[PDB]
Design a protein around this ligand. Structure first.
Ligand SMILES: Cc1ccc(C(=O)NC2CC2)cc1-c1ccc2c(c1)NC(=O)C21CCCC1
Length: 349
């Protein structure tokens, strides 16, 4: 059952994929990786195929490849990107040096669709419903997206949404620097490294997406980390003494206390004309103290989603075993674990 593969040059690299995959063409400005759209003749689905190129060139690359393939194989929810196929042209471990990952092709990301545009309330309901329903799941598997922004929500022409990139986020100093969308969605505890963080960081990010869809404006379009934080504290207010205690970075805690105290603003005088149910929800997602933000499961029950909420159709995941993260292994060792996971792979129905 080893299929026939054919060769094609795309993205200035040779792609070698099963015959079932036809009409490959690069998508994104290169924004998503080496990703091509293709037709799967075997399932009749349009798919995105991502080739990981020379993916075991270092220990850190052999472990990312493994981590992405683990994450991907774990996720089976309508609103989360998952694997329809993984393959390699390799006939053995010896020969293993390329992994291709196949998932659904939705066609665009939220970014392209809505940039600079204000969405109607029922449109925002449905898109955020799906983000929280997707995140309910992610979070139940004990995984943290950590980098939830519009560009890595994949959306089709029916405004159906799959979340991309959960658990992989590792931007450098310079990608996070200045006036850049790659930071406008980050929870302050994470942008400024205040504490040992958990999953509540992704509900902060939904709060930012949700406000932008509702007003057509970036919520916190900071020109740098500090300017962005100043933008944050002015709306939600400066930390209380409760929160300052939980800020384990003494360094960051000391700079925070430097700032002149400000009250939390009135969200109804910010989000003028907006469904009060939207504003109530914004209010409980955009709380500075991470321990007190609303959760994905709690938010799904909120009245604002009265029209979509079904408690028996909002599933959870099995646990995700990330014990491998705390493990220091050789290149061959990650490679072999990654091989194991490819050949053991089972298609969905
Ligand atoms: C092909 C692919 C493989 C993996 C991941 C991914 O999320 N990995 C991290 C979760 C571990 C995302 C895509 C990917 C990248 C870009 C797109 C799609 C899929 N599906 C799509 O529809 C698009 C192409 C049009 C914009 C979104």
């Amino acid at each position: 059952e080893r299929p026939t593969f054919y060769r094609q040059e795309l993205n200035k690299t040779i792609w070698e994929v099963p015959e079932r995959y036809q009409n490959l063409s690069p998508v994104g400005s290169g924004a998503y990786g080496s990703v091509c759209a293709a037709f799967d003749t075997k399932t009749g689905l349009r798919v995105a195929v991502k080739k990981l190129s020379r993916p075991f060139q270092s220990i850190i690359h052999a472990k990312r490849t493994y981590r992405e393939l683990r994450l991907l194989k774990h996720m089976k929810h309508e609103n989360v990107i998952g694997l329809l196929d993984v393959f390699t042209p390799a006939r053995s471990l010896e020969e293993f040096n390329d992994v291709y990952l196949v998932t659904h092709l939705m066609g665009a990301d939220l970014n392209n669709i809505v940039k600079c545009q204000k969405l109607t309330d029922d449109h925002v309901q449905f898109l955020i419903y799906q983000i929280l329903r997707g995140l309910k799941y992610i979070h139940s598997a004990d995984i943290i997206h950590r980098d939830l922004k519009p560009s890595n929500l994949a959306v089709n022409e029916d405004c159906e949404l799959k979340i991309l990139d959960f658990g992989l986020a590792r931007h450098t100093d310079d990608e996070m620097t200045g006036y850049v969308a790659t930071r406008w969605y980050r929870a302050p505890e994470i942008m400024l490294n205040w504490m040992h963080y958990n999953q509540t960081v992704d509900i902060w990010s939904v709060g930012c997406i949700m406000a932008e869809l509702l007003t057509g404006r970036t919520l916190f379009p900071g020109t740098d980390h500090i300017d962005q934080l100043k933008l944050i504290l002015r709306l939600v207010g400066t930390p209380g003494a409760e929160l300052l205690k939980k800020i384990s970075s003494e360094s960051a805690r000391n700079y925070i206390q430097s700032l002149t105290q400000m009250p939390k603003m009135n969200f109804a005088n910010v989000f003028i004309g907006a469904n009060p149910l939207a504003v109530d929800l914004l209010e409980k997602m955009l709380v500075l103290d991470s321990d007190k933000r609303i959760t994905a499961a709690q938010a799904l029950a909120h009245a604002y989603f009265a029209q979509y909420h079904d408690p028996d159709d909002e599933p959870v995941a099995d646990p995700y075993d990330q014990s491998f993260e705390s493990r220091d292994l050789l290149i061959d060792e990650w490679k072999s674990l990654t091989y194991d996971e490819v050949i053991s792979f089972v298609p969905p129905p």
